[PDB]
Write an enzyme that holds these catalytic residues in place. Structure first.
Site, mmCIF file in Angstrom:
data_model
loop_
_atom_site.group_PDB
_atom_site.id
_atom_site.type_symbol
_atom_site.label_atom_id
_atom_site.label_comp_id
_atom_site.label_asym_id
_atom_site.label_seq_id
_atom_site.Cartn_x
_atom_site.Cartn_y
_atom_site.Cartn_z
ATOM 1 N N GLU A 20 53.397 32.118 45.122
ATOM 2 C CA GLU A 20 52.062 32.467 44.637
ATOM 3 C C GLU A 20 51.960 33.924 44.167
ATOM 4 O O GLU A 20 52.946 34.666 44.173
ATOM 5 C CB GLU A 20 51.027 32.227 45.756
ATOM 6 N N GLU A 36 53.992 30.738 52.740
ATOM 7 C CA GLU A 36 54.428 29.746 53.718
ATOM 8 C C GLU A 36 55.725 30.018 54.470
ATOM 9 O O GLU A 36 56.264 29.115 55.108
ATOM 10 C CB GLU A 36 54.503 28.362 53.066
ATOM 11 N N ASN A 119 42.410 34.722 49.486
ATOM 12 C CA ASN A 119 43.404 33.984 48.736
ATOM 13 C C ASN A 119 43.819 34.612 47.404
ATOM 14 O O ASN A 119 45.008 34.736 47.130
ATOM 15 C CB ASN A 119 42.895 32.562 48.511
ATOM 16 N N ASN A 174 39.184 29.532 45.255
ATOM 17 C CA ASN A 174 40.582 29.870 45.044
ATOM 18 C C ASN A 174 40.815 30.924 43.969
ATOM 19 O O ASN A 174 40.701 32.131 44.222
ATOM 20 C CB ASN A 174 41.346 28.593 44.694
ATOM 21 N N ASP A 228 43.592 26.159 40.811
ATOM 22 C CA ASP A 228 44.152 27.146 41.719
ATOM 23 C C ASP A 228 43.986 28.514 41.037
ATOM 24 O O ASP A 228 42.867 29.018 40.917
ATOM 25 C CB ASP A 228 45.633 26.848 41.983
ATOM 26 N N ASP A 231 43.827 33.007 34.556
ATOM 27 C CA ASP A 231 43.834 34.260 33.796
ATOM 28 C C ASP A 231 43.388 33.967 32.365
ATOM 29 O O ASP A 231 43.492 32.834 31.889
ATOM 30 C CB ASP A 231 45.236 34.899 33.745
ATOM 31 N N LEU A 272 49.505 31.910 37.745
ATOM 32 C CA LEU A 272 50.181 32.360 36.535
ATOM 33 C C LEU A 272 49.826 33.807 36.234
ATOM 34 O O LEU A 272 48.865 34.342 36.771
ATOM 35 C CB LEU A 272 49.810 31.460 35.350
ATOM 36 N N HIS A 273 50.615 34.436 35.375
ATOM 37 C CA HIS A 273 50.379 35.821 35.008
ATOM 38 C C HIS A 273 51.146 36.121 33.732
ATOM 39 O O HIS A 273 52.281 35.678 33.572
ATOM 40 C CB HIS A 273 50.855 36.748 36.126
ATOM 41 N N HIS A 286 54.239 24.847 43.483
ATOM 42 C CA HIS A 286 54.568 24.399 44.828
ATOM 43 C C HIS A 286 55.361 23.101 44.976
ATOM 44 O O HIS A 286 55.568 22.639 46.097
ATOM 45 C CB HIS A 286 53.281 24.299 45.652
HETATM 46 CA CA LIG Z 1 47.499 36.108 37.493
HETATM 47 CA CA LIG Z 2 45.576 30.553 45.015
#
Ligand SMILES: [Ca+2]
Ligand SMILES: [Ca+2]
Length: 313
Positions: A20, A36, A119, A174, A228, A231, A272-273, A286
């Site tokens: 994440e 996790e 989160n 989220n 989730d 952007d 994402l980014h 995941h």
């Molecule tokens: Ca991002």
């Molecule tokens: Ca998240």
């Protein structure tokens, strides 16, 4: 009938439990979190730096406070200093230095209430940090999450250091993003409520000041999960990881229904980014607990860390 594209996805690295919070710092280095990771059934989440060339991983920080391990889940890079703000499901909000040192920002909000586990987070161009908090109280309180009950909250960490709960009663808030006007002023706050398949919006009137809560968009699918991380691209299109649907939904500036979908070679995209100044989007997922990258139609919207404090324009 919504158009779907199938771009080429390239694997970057894998074996990152709950991959994440992908983020790029001011030096262009890439980081992600592994919420996790566990040691003896107890939380032992880590913050990793990934070498984009080889894909080699380096754990720079394993947050822990008074014997309580963290569950880092989301990141944002600061502007005035090259440091990371990390939303932790167990520890709240953390500020992490690139050398691995860190500090827990707050144990209580402005009203004296115990801080909730966070989160994800997003900076607006004024330097205020908007944060989602789907977990219950931070350590040492017993770990819990608003997946069924509606106790998820939204916080705003202002430039003058105040931690203000701006709203609550969410069922697992989220992803979160801030839409700005062309003049750079914060206009709307977009919050993802995962299980309900909804994207909510608020009008931003100022630091920690939001009003006019509205159902902004609807996430497709009846699968378990939903929106989730997210952007904006440079044209203000909002890309949203639809956990459990094998797709990243693309919303237009006005929201509503997706104007387009992006098919992923996996079922659980988490976040994402964009790589600064490129059309490259890094995606965490995941299903295989890995990081991938693909080329979008255009450049991403500049993050706060990319703007100039002492600029002319
Ligand atoms: Ca991002
Ligand atoms: Ca998240």
């Amino acid at each position: 009938e919504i158009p779907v594209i199938e771009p080429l996805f390239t694997k970057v690295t894998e074996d990152i439990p709950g991959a994440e919070g992908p983020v790029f710092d001011k030096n262009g280095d890439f980081y992600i979190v592994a919420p996790e990771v566990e040691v003896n059934g107890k939380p032992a989440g880590e913050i990793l730096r990934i070498d984009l060339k080889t894909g080699k991983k380096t754990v720079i920080c394993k947050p822990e406070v008074n014997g309580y391990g963290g569950i880092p889940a989301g990141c944002q890079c600061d502007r005035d200093a090259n440091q990371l703000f990390v939303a932790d499901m167990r520890l709240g909000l953390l500020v992490v230095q690139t050398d691995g040192t860190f500090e827990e920002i707050a144990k209580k909000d402005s009203e004296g209430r115990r801080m909730q586990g966070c989160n994800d987070c997003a900076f607006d161009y004024e330097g205020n940090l908007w944060i989602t908090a789907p977990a219950g109280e931070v350590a040492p309180a017993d770990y819990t999450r608003s997946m069924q009950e509606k106790f998820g909250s939204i916080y705003c960490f202002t430039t003058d250091g105040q931690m203000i709960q701006v709203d609550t009663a969410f069922q697992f808030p989220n992803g979160i993003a801030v839409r700005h006007m062309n003049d750079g002023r914060p206009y709307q706050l977009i919050v993802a409520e995962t299980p309900t398949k909804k994207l909510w919006s608020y009008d931003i009137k100022g630091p920690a000041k939001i009003e006019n809560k509205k159902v902004w968009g609807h996430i497709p699918g009846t699968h378990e999960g939903g929106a989730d991380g997210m952007d904006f691209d440079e044209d203000n299109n909002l890309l949203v990881a639809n956990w459990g649907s094998s797709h990243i939904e693309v919303f237009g500036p006005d929201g509503g229904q997706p104007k387009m979908r992006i098919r992923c070679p996996f079922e659980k995209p988490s976040n994402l980014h964009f790589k600064p100044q490129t059309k490259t989007i890094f995606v965490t997922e995941h299903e295989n607990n890995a990081v991938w990258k693909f080329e979008w139609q255009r450049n991403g919207k500049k993050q706060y860390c990319e703007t100039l404090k002492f600029g002319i324009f």
